[PDB]
Amino acid sequence: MTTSQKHRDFVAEPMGEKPVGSLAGIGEVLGKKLEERGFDKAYVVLGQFLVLKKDEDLFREWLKDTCGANAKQSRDCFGCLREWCDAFL
Amino acid sequence: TTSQKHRDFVAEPMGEKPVGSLAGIGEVLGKKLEERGFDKAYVVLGQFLVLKKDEDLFREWLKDTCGANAKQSRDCFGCLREWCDAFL
């Protein structure tokens, strides 16, 4: 297993009302910028992931444009949502 | 009360179910949603979540997007809200 423990904790259970900072790749700096743009809970970012039909390129570009995520951060966030969806959606 | 379509939707993960599986979303509405990119139920779930599960804003969005009436948008909202309470 090469994922972060933080990825593993997120994909292991329904997300409920978890804050956006529970997402893999979303540290405190990215989290605050997402919160300022209205993406305050992880499920709101899931929402954008789903509205983009789970497309990696569109989602990672959206994350970059919205909070300045770098490639690793956007890959980790995308991967965490993709695996959560595979488990629970 | 609820339809059986609602109960069937809220009882299980939606996976790749088409948009027409949502309560309230019949053939006409489903066609119009598909034409605008919302071809699977989870894409509509996505919009519900992006709108922070806000009943008024989601139902208005559904009306503006596919012409759903008050009953249709009511049923679609309720099915998504109850699905989320069970699985999200």
Protein model, in words:
Two copies of one chain form a homodimer. Chain A is about 65% helix and about 0% strand. Chain A is mostly helical. Chain A starts with a helix and ends with a helix. In chain A, about 40% of the residues are buried. The interface of A and B includes residues 38 and 41 of A. It is classed as dna binding protein. Keywords: alpha helical, mscs, minor groove binder, DNA binding protein. It forms a dimeric assembly. Barrier-to-autointegration factor soaked in isopropanol: 1 of 14 in MSCS set.
Short summary:
With 89 residues, the first copy, chain A, is an all-alpha fold. Chain A contains five helices and no strands. Chain A has one domain (1-89).
How many strands of chain A?
A: 0
Classify the oligomer.
Answer: homodimer
What is the gyration radius of chain A calculated from CA atoms?
11 Å
Largest interface: A-B, 18 and 18 residues
User: Major sheet of chain A: size, sense and barrel closure?
Assistant: none
Proportion of residues in helical segments of chain A: 55-70%
N-to-C span of chain A: 22 Å
The H/E string of chain A reads HHHHH
What structural category characterises the helix and strand content of chain A? Answer: mainly alpha
Name the beta content range of chain A: under 5%
Query: Domains counted in the coordinates of chain A: how many?
Result: 1
Shape of chain A: globular
What is the number of helical segments of chain A per DSSP (H or I, 4+ residues)?
5
GO biological process, one term (chain A): negative regulation of protein ADP-ribosylation
Subcellular location (chain A): Nucleus; Chromosome; Nucleus envelope; Cytoplasm
InterPro entries (chain A): BAF, BAF_prot, BAF_sf
Organism (chain A): Homo sapiens
